[PDB]
Write an enzyme that holds these catalytic residues in place. Structure first.
Site, PDB file in Angstrom:
ATOM      1  N   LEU A 102       0.843  -1.189   0.000  1.00  0.00           N
ATOM      2  CA  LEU A 102       0.000   0.000   0.000  1.00  0.00           C
ATOM      3  C   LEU A 102       0.881   1.243   0.000  1.00  0.00           C
ATOM      4  O   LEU A 102       1.987   1.236   0.547  1.00  0.00           O
ATOM      5  CB  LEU A 102      -0.943   0.051   1.207  1.00  0.00           C
ATOM      6  CG  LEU A 102      -2.188  -0.833   1.107  1.00  0.00           C
ATOM      7  CD1 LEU A 102      -1.845  -2.292   1.354  1.00  0.00           C
ATOM      8  CD2 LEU A 102      -3.301  -0.375   2.049  1.00  0.00           C
ATOM      9  N   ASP A 146       2.541  -3.716  19.041  1.00  0.00           N
ATOM     10  CA  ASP A 146       3.362  -2.538  18.760  1.00  0.00           C
ATOM     11  C   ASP A 146       2.673  -1.604  17.770  1.00  0.00           C
ATOM     12  O   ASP A 146       3.277  -1.129  16.806  1.00  0.00           O
ATOM     13  CB  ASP A 146       4.746  -2.938  18.245  1.00  0.00           C
ATOM     14  CG  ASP A 146       5.742  -1.763  18.280  1.00  0.00           C
ATOM     15  OD1 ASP A 146       5.496  -0.787  19.018  1.00  0.00           O
ATOM     16  OD2 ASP A 146       6.765  -1.808  17.570  1.00  0.00           O
ATOM     17  N   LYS A 164       1.449   1.549  15.998  1.00  0.00           N
ATOM     18  CA  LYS A 164       1.893   2.926  15.827  1.00  0.00           C
ATOM     19  C   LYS A 164       1.252   3.446  14.549  1.00  0.00           C
ATOM     20  O   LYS A 164       0.921   2.655  13.662  1.00  0.00           O
ATOM     21  CB  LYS A 164       3.424   3.014  15.712  1.00  0.00           C
ATOM     22  CG  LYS A 164       4.169   2.410  16.893  1.00  0.00           C
ATOM     23  CD  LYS A 164       5.649   2.730  16.863  1.00  0.00           C
ATOM     24  CE  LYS A 164       6.404   1.825  15.903  1.00  0.00           C
ATOM     25  NZ  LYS A 164       7.891   1.949  16.139  1.00  0.00           N
TER      26      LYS A 164
END
Ligand SMILES: O=C(O)c1cc([N+](=O)[O-])ccc1NCCc1c[nH]c2cc(Cl)ccc12
Length: 293
Positions: free
Chosen positions: A78, A122, A124
């Site tokens: 992407l 994790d 983010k």
């Protein structure tokens, strides 16, 4: 037939293109702590199963390749991620309908992987991939160590702690799915306010930034907290701030849901599945971002 076009992230991640078909993928190269011993079979077993566990809001794992000293993971490509998109939107804000759509989709993806007993660990903004069609996808799962991949140890690693759940920072030995809900709550607040919620620069600074906003936790709001391995009775005692101050100008539906995603006690923190039923989402749509690719 695939050749490296461009480094797109740092494992290190490359845009790889087929020199005859034009097809492009994301090639993730993970260096190992050994030059000879490769990846244990049990880790390759666990990773490989995720090729056949698919959801529209999880990046697609296309192939797994391992050698004596490297693990390669091939993913769908992407163009953009939510970090880049917020930076481009930073002076104005991502529109509320798109905030709401992205949050709903990310909860759908987390509900799926939590239902399969897989954590992200994790989350983010830079790990959340977006496309022109309005989709957003969980990527860069923090699964290497959980699965036993012998990743190269990095003696001077600089870790971003901003999205880390407080039970992790207080030394919990076992993670729960709630750690991902905390991280997503932080990301929700960041899209609303256009600023990271808790940008700490060490584990104690991260903890104290949380404490100064949500109050220093005690047994009243987080039963068991004072028995956590890194809990200290000598923590400074900050009063709790209201969420009307933490995420202005989010409406009361959104503030409601955010408070349940940032609940101190991981046992009471809202589940992804339950969050999808929250009244904040009763008018949710699927807008598209305007991307400059
Ligand atoms: O993203 C990474 O970098 C990564 C690294 C390792 N690793 O290094 O061990 C393993 C897996 C990774 N991604 C899996 C992505 C995925 C595809 N389908 C899924 C279904 C569920 Cl339920 C949960 C996750 C997935």
């Amino acid at each position: 037939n695939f050749q490296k076009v461009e480094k797109i992230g740092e494992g290190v991640v490359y845009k790889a293109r087929n020199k005859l078909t034009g097809e492009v993928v994301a090639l993730k190269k993970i260096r190992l702590d050994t030059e000879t011993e490769g990846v244990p079979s049990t880790a390759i077993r666990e990773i490989s199963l995720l090729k056949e566990l698919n959801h529209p809001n999880i990046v697609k794992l296309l192939d797994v390749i391992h050698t004596e000293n490297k693990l390669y993971l091939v993913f769908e490509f992407l163009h953009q991620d939510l970090k880049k998109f917020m930076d481009a939107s930073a002076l104005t804000g991502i529109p509320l309908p798109l905030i709401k759509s992205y949050l709903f989709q990310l909860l759908q993806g987390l509900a799926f992987c939590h239902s399969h007993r897989v954590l992200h660990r994790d989350l983010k903004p830079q790990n959340l991939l977006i496309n022109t069609e309005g989709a957003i996808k969980l990527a860069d799962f923090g699964l290497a160590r959980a699965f036993g991949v012998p990743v190269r140890t990095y003696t001077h690693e600089v870790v971003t702690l901003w999205y880390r759940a407080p039970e992790i920072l207080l030394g919990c030995k076992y993670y729960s799915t709630a750690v991902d809900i905390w991280s997503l709550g932080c990301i929700f607040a960041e899209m609303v306010t256009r600023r990271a919620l808790f940008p700490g620069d060490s584990e104690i600074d991260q903890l104290f930034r949380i404490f100064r906003t949500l109050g220093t936790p005690d047994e009243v709001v987080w039963p068991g907290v004072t028995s956590m391995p890194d809990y200290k009775p000598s923590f400074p005692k900050w009063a709790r701030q209201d969420f009307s101050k933490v995420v202005p100008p989010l409406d009361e539906d959104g503030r409601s849901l955010l408070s349940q995603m940032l609940h101190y006690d991981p046992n009471k923190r809202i589940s992804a599945k339950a969050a999808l039923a929250h009244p904040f989402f009763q008018d949710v749509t699927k807008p598209v971002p305007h991307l400059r690719l």
